[PDB]
Amino acid sequence: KETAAAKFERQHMDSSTSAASSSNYCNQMMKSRNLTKDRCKPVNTFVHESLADVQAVCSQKNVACKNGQTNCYQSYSTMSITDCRETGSSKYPNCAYKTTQANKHIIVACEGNPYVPVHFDASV
Ligand SMILES: [Cl-]
Ligand SMILES: [Cl-]
Ligand SMILES: [Cl-]
């Protein structure tokens, strides 16, 4: 039901904050974006830039995706991001996440018309 583009926005966009300020940021966002519903999503990255800046990456540096596909693009500049990763003590449904704030380049897979981000590959 959800389109691939809408799923990318829901799972990775957080333009309301400029950076994760507390170590509780991941637990609250993974829950409110509904990523801990049927299970604890193990890893998830949130980008704190406007949707227009993230969408613009689809017209930046064309690179290979880890999967070998070639519709991945690397942002020319670094972006504010938050890495959310389950801790060794996380147990559905008591999902526990480690919050790691950083500033790096993002790599995303783009598709469609319009040509927008549909998958978050990695950050460098
Ligand atoms: Cl859409
Ligand atoms: Cl939802
Ligand atoms: Cl991710």
Curated annotation (Swiss-Prot):
Q: Where in the cell is it found?
A: Secreted
Q: Which GO terms describe its biological process?
A: defense response to Gram-positive bacterium
Which EC number applies? 4.6.1.18
Give the molecular function GO annotations: lyase activity; nucleic acid binding; ribonuclease A activity; RNA nuclease activity
Q: Which reaction does it catalyse?
A: an [RNA] containing cytidine + H2O = an [RNA]-3'-cytidine-3'-phosphate + a 5'-hydroxy-ribonucleotide-3'-[RNA]; an [RNA] containing uridine + H2O = an [RNA]-3'-uridine-3'-phosphate + a 5'-hydroxy-ribonucleotide-3'-[RNA]
- According to its UniProt record, where is this protein mainly located? secreted
| Key word Zinc-finger present | no
Q: Does the keyword 4Fe-4S apply?
A: no
Q: What tissues is it present in?
A: Pancreas.
GO cellular component terms? extracellular region
Tell me the disulfide pairings in this chain: 26-84, 40-95, 58-110, 65-72
Positions of substrate binding:
7, 10, 41-45, 66, 85
Glycosylation site residues: 1, 7, 34, 37, 41
Catalytic positions are: 12, 119
Annotated keywords = Disulfide bond, Endonuclease, Glycation, Glycoprotein, Hydrolase, Lyase, Nuclease, Secreted, Signal
Q: What is known about its subunit structure?
A: Interacts with and forms tight 1:1 complexes with RNH1. Dimerization of two such complexes may occur. Interaction with RNH1 inhibits this protein. Monomer.
What is the documented function of this protein? Endonuclease that catalyzes the cleavage of RNA on the 3' side of pyrimidine nucleotides. Acts on single-stranded and double-stranded RNA.
Q: Which family does it belong to?
A: Belongs to the pancreatic ribonuclease family.
Q: What is this protein called?
A: Ribonuclease pancreatic
> What is the scientific name of the source organism?
Bos taurus
Q: Which residues of the full protein are shown?
A: 27 to 150 of 150
